Design an enzyme around this catalytic site. Structure first.
Site, PDB file in Angstrom:
ATOM      1  N   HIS B  43      -5.284  22.655  19.650  1.00  0.00           N
ATOM      2  CA  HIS B  43      -5.207  22.847  18.216  1.00  0.00           C
ATOM      3  C   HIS B  43      -3.886  23.504  17.817  1.00  0.00           C
ATOM      4  CE1 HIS B  43      -6.706  26.952  19.141  1.00  0.00           C
ATOM      5  NE2 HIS B  43      -5.900  27.253  18.152  1.00  0.00           N
ATOM      6  N   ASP B  99     -10.662  21.705  23.531  1.00  0.00           N
ATOM      7  CA  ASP B  99      -9.386  22.218  22.975  1.00  0.00           C
ATOM      8  C   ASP B  99      -8.437  22.474  24.171  1.00  0.00           C
ATOM      9  OD1 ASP B  99      -7.777  23.186  21.216  1.00  0.00           O
ATOM     10  OD2 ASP B  99      -8.788  25.141  20.783  1.00  0.00           O
ATOM     11  N   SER B 197      -3.840  32.381  19.959  1.00  0.00           N
ATOM     12  CA  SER B 197      -4.462  31.094  20.276  1.00  0.00           C
ATOM     13  C   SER B 197      -3.726  30.461  21.410  1.00  0.00           C
ATOM     14  CB  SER B 197      -4.331  30.237  19.000  1.00  0.00           C
ATOM     15  OG  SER B 197      -5.581  29.610  18.720  1.00  0.00           O
TER      16      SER B 197
END
EC number: 3.4.21.5
Lengths: 26, 248, 10
Positions: B43, B99, B197
């Site tokens: 992502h 992901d 992230s």
């Protein structure tokens, strides 16, 4: 040679909180 | 990282910074798995609801960093990507299932005191360490508050039992995910946050003393909110897609 | 806030 850190594992020094990890693997 | 501490020098030599060329900015974290291969959250590269679709030409990979914003002359190595691969069944539409993405560096990076790879779990490592209760470590230069660190931060967090994870959200949780954090009762806090992230969730093997990447910082609801947890891609469940791209 | 990086790197 993966996951053996040059300034820690390689010289047999522990980081300041790794202990808390190992203490949890019962 | 919310409620973390400053990493020590060379504590996480596999930590990578995903950096935007223009405007120059921290995109996400990643981890070095070999001299040419970097691992991160899909992502970070592709997220259509936000008009996020990054190409190879669009980024830099920075290895051996400590400082978030300094150019660490003689320490850090900055590279260019030769190729990006996203998991073919990544789910950005519903829950960020799968992901995961690999980045091929245009040229090998040299190992050093500050640059060194993490191990990929094999079935018995994962079987033994992925247990509710067992602590892992997350590192990153993200937001300090649901607030920008000066230096690479760290926090140790417990893996939580599957059901407690499901019950904390309305989002459909798959088998390629695991959540980690403190119960609001445990009265301890800490969590990934904006900027973290795509970084690593690692554990240290009590058997051979090696560090293993078990998860990838995937998503959460707010940062360090009580009764909510961080969701991580389960690196071992995606291990064969990994081998596969590397070997071909 | 980011300090300047070498041009060889772009």
């Amino acid at each position: 040679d993966c996951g053996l850190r040059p300034l820690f594992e390689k010289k047999s020094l522990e980081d300041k909180t790794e202990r808390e990890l190992l203490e949890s693997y019962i | 990282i919310v409620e973390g501490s400053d990493a020590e020098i060379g504590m996480s030599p596999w930590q990578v910074m995903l950096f935007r060329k223009s405007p120059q900015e921290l995109l996400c974290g990643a981890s070095l798995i070999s001299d040419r291969w970097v691992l991160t959250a899909a992502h970070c590269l592709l997220y259509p609801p936000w008009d996020k679709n990054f190409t190879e030409n669009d980024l830099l990979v920075r290895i051996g960093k400590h400082s978030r914003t300094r150019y660490e002359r003689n320490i850090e190595k900055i590279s260019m990507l030769e190729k990006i691969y996203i998991h073919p069944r990544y789910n950005w539409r519903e829950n960020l299932d799968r992901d995961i993405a690999l980045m091929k560096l245009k040229k090998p990076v040299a190992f050093s005191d500050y640059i060194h790879p993490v191990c990929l779990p094999d079935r018995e490592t994962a079987a033994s360490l992925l247990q509710a209760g067992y602590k892992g470590r997350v590192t990153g230069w993200g937001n300090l508050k649901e607030g920008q660190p000066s230096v690479l931060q760290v926090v140790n967090l417990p893996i939580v039992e599957r059901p407690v994870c499901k019950d904390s959200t309305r989002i459909r949780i798959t088998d390629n995910m695991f959540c980690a954090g403190y119960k609001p009762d445990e009265g301890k806090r800490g969590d990934a946050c904006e900027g973290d992230s795509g970084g690593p969730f690692v554990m240290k093997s009590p058997f051979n003393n090696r560090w293993y990447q078990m998860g990838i910082v995937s998503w959460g609801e707010g940062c360090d909110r009580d009764g909510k947890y961080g969701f991580y891609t389960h690196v071992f469940r995606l291990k064969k897609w990994i081998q596969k791209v590397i070997d071909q | 806030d980011f300090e300047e990086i070498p041009g060889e790197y772009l």
